[PDB]
Amino acid sequence: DICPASEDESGQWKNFRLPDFVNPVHYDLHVKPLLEEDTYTGTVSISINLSAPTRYLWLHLRETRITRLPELKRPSGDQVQVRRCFEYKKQEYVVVEAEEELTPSSGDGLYLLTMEFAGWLNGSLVGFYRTTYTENGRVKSIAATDHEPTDARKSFPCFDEPNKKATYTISITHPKEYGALSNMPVAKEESVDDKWTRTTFEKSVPMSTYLVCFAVHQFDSVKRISNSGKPLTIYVQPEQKHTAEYAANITKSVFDYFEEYFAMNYSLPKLDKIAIPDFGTGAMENWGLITYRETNLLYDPKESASSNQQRVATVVAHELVHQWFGNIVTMDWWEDLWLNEGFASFFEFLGVNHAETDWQMRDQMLLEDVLPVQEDDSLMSSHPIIVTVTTPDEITSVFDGISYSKGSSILRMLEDWIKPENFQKGCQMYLEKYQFKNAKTSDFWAALEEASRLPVKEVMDTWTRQMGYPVLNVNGVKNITQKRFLLDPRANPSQPPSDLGYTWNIPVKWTEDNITSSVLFNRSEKEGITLNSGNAFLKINPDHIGFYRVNYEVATWDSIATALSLNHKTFSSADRASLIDDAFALARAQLLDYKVALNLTKYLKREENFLPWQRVISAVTYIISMFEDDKELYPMIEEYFQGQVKPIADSLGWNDAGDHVTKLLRSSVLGFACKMGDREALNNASSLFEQWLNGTVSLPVNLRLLVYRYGMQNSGNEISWNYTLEQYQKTSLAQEKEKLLYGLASVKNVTLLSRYLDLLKDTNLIKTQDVFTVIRYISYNSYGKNMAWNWIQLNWDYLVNRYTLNNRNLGRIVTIAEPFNTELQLWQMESFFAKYPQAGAGEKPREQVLETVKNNIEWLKQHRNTIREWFFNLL
Ligand SMILES: *[C@@H]1O[C@H](CO)[C@@H](O[C@@H]2O[C@H](CO)[C@@H](O[C@@H]3O[C@H](CO)[C@@H](O)[C@H](O)[C@H]3NC(C)=O)[C@H](O)[C@H]2NC(C)=O)[C@H](O)[C@H]1NC(C)=O
């Protein structure tokens, strides 16, 4: 109404990107929430460095409206006359037009633009919003922001681009019962009424809009002091105060470690962490005020699993890395997002490894990031690490496996190639150089090239400017050639077009005889290279350190199987996992006969290590799901793999004994036993479940999930379903809540699963943050695979309206269709996608799940008989 929408394209505001010549220096931001009303108002003053003649000034704004006609100042101080304001929806701009036009800011003086705005706190988990929780029977409120990537513009009008760094002084007018937090410490608190307080924070260092954060809360706090002498506090509900302790410990330890590792001081005087009762992502690295989902921050040693403990530790560490990589140095544009996320996903393992020494964290990188993303990046519908993005939906989409996991994986290879010491120093120099500014990928290579003198740009560009990765083909034990690895054998290996033509500069490592050698495999060695006393066995890619797969000659693979059966310890735990992972991926890709891959599983009755079991289970889970409906194959696969885990499942038992990694092993090994239908394992689950239903017995923390799942699956009924639902409401610990939701999703009852799906529309029962988690759990249920799939179709309009097409999690929900493997199911998917063709942030996931389902159909056609023969002949 005041700044009406206009379809006027005839200006520079038609461009997706902000202009080069308008730059913010300082933001004066004031917001006043009306918490009980779900509204807020605010005014913002922005100091602007103008570089070119313009009759129009524009910046980002979404949903939140301008309420007063904005006022502009010249660097001299004079009021500039304003003809009109208008909104341009297509690119999310509010544009104001001066009568006349004005000239560049020449000296130390700047233009000043102030605008008045009003927005909503309800119906959303982005921008500035309010949510509730219960304390001593009273409903309490908390308000916070969440901006990454393009949501700062919902909170307040701003230049919402990562490279438009400005300095911030924030103030909030709030009721006095509430405290206020932001990026910086409190500077002054002044009484407005005897009811309202105005909290003003001290000036920030230069930072990006997406990092700007404020909150209004009535939380308690657990406190720690760094070696720097700076306060590190975690804000937490009084009820949950005891569960903030562990996160407090890790923050201390990892904060102290990183400041020392990066040779650079944390740029702010304090650091705060807070978990919002309803929060849309895992966690957010808002400088000095890191926000969390409760499951990623709050941990109870008496109730939470080792899995949960590691998750809290890892996310906290991840969030800390960002204080350096992301906050101090930011990417210039979202195309270089991996400079934030890859680095965070890499250093997270070093952080936690320092804090928890016997967790074998560096090895766990293989399970968490490397091997899972080698599945992703073997699809045609992957994308290069450096990604072209032209809409907010494309921007948000690239917060994915590639940015995080592949980013992490190629740094891991890079570090090993370049040696840790030099990698460390190179990172420090980069951090020194671009501090409080923005960097491109090219800048990071040059920094490490200064630190090692190795050809970093030349080599790392191949891993970064094209999607995918190579398989090394072994000829004659010693000759290797490279070829792009694709899961679909029919796919065109040259597509989509790449300047580098899908050949890589591969840093290659191998183990001769406990002795390690290194070679860079050059791109232009078109006919391959030869690996430098006379040998009978070459172990290529030790600990799967390089982002590629190795395909040995079939005779070699045969010998590996035999060697595993004789003495499996001949290979390290990591090497076993890697060989198993490669073989099964190769078999999946029709590059190795399945009988050869399956032969590697024969030794398993003697396997006792975490890493090989995890990758075995990953590979079997896929094969088993492809044959779910096959009454001939399934029992045979079940019978075999049941026999292979039985010894380790029996050996570890149903009890929380041993170190961290052992406890993780027990979880997944007992789970697989249950999955494979081991009567004794299932009876343990039922027995414990029955006891838990008696309402006193606290289950062993690392067995709970399994007990809820397989207990409910095997002996669940309405009475125990209702009980479980009550328990979920009653527990304060989010980590327990999440397990109970999985339990509820496990019942073998269409009526009860139907009730559960209906609860998704009930915001008093299922939090907005948990809807997609629940749908995904239900999709795992043998009945619910189809129910969840059908429910998202029937309720698509509802979900879009509730979340918007810009919601990443909504975009991704179609991946519940991944297990599909028939032409009928593919037709359903295509029909539904054609009916709702506006995919938003779901565009990539749609492409990916379609490719996956097409692959599944082909896979069945190619491999059913082969796999059938192997099992039939064996049993
Ligand atoms: C939870 O799972 C446990 C397995 O991990 C079950 O314990 C097993 O019960 C079996 C039957 O009671 C035993 O089988 C016997 O095994 C011995 C070999 O040591 C054989 O001689 C026998 O053929 C066989 N049956 C006999 C002699 O009647 C297992 O030995 C036993 N223990 C282990 C460690 O595997 C639990 O019963 C199960 N708990 C619940 C509540 O179901």
Ligand SMILES: *[C@@H]1O[C@H](CO)[C@@H](O[C@@H]2O[C@H](CO)[C@@H](O[C@@H]3O[C@H](CO)[C@@H](O)[C@H](O)[C@H]3NC(C)=O)[C@H](O)[C@H]2NC(C)=O)[C@H](O)[C@H]1NC(C)=O
């Ligand atoms: C690598 O995988 C190979 C291919 O499956 C294995 O070789 C197969 O072993 C089976 C014995 O376990 C044989 O299958 C069947 O054996 C029964 C005996 O009970 C006979 O009746 C069947 O006739 C026979 N099947 C067929 C089709 O003849 C196979 O003889 C054999 N397959 C081949 C092609 O030789 C290897 O053992 C395995 N290598 C390892 C573990 O190192």
Ligand SMILES: *[C@@H]1O[C@H](CO)[C@@H](O[C@@H]2O[C@H](CO)[C@@H](O)[C@H](O)[C@H]2NC(C)=O)[C@H](O)[C@H]1NC(C)=O
């Ligand atoms: C938050 O609540 C407000 C007010 O209830 C919502 O705006 C209303 O939307 C309904 C239904 O579309 C209309 O009938 C009302 O006239 C609107 N009220 C006002 C004051 O404009 C708003 O949609 C909610 N915000 C979000 C983001 O969902």
Ligand SMILES: *[C@@H]1O[C@H](CO)[C@@H](O[C@@H]2O[C@H](CO)[C@@H](O)[C@H](O)[C@H]2NC(C)=O)[C@H](O)[C@H]1NC(C)=O
């Ligand atoms: C956080 O750190 C403290 C100290 O570093 C951990 O140690 C506890 O306190 C005493 C003495 O400090 C130790 O002897 C005990 O082993 C610890 N527990 C108890 C109950 O006293 C503490 O465990 C850490 N908090 C966690 C992991 O949540």
Ligand SMILES: *[C@@H]1O[C@H](CO)[C@@H](O[C@@H]2O[C@H](CO)[C@@H](O)[C@H](O)[C@H]2NC(C)=O)[C@H](O)[C@H]1NC(C)=O
């Ligand atoms: C799934 O759960 C429903 C709900 O408990 C079961 O239906 C109940 O059946 C009993 C008798 O067996 C009746 O007394 C209840 O009134 C029924 N409830 C409802 C809502 O109809 C149903 O039997 C279960 N189905 C399976 C296959 O186990």
Ligand SMILES: *[C@@H]1O[C@H](CO)[C@@H](O[C@@H]2O[C@H](CO)[C@@H](O)[C@H](O)[C@H]2NC(C)=O)[C@H](O)[C@H]1NC(C)=O
């Ligand atoms: C289990 O929980 C449900 C939900 O609270 C119970 O209540 C019935 O639920 C149906 C819908 O599923 C409603 O239409 C009925 O009005 C509810 N009946 C009431 C409130 O009395 C259900 O009765 C519970 N069953 C058991 C065995 O505890």
Ligand SMILES: *[C@@H]1O[C@H](CO)[C@@H](O)[C@H](O)[C@H]1NC(C)=O
């Ligand atoms: C950096 O940290 C050191 C050691 O903790 C401290 O003494 C110093 O004040 C800091 N220097 C700067 C420039 O921030």
Ligand SMILES: *[C@@H]1O[C@H](CO)[C@@H](O)[C@H](O)[C@H]1NC(C)=O
């Ligand atoms: C491997 O490559 C080298 C040099 O190109 C050649 O001498 C040798 O014959 C090749 N083949 C095998 C099986 O070693």
Ligand SMILES: N[C@@H](CC(=O)O)C(=O)O
């Ligand atoms: N940066 C966030 C993602 C987001 O909030 O969009 C995370 O890593 O959890």
Ligand SMILES: [Ca+2]
């Ligand atoms: Ca966000």
Ligand SMILES: [Zn+2]
């Ligand atoms: Zn991150």
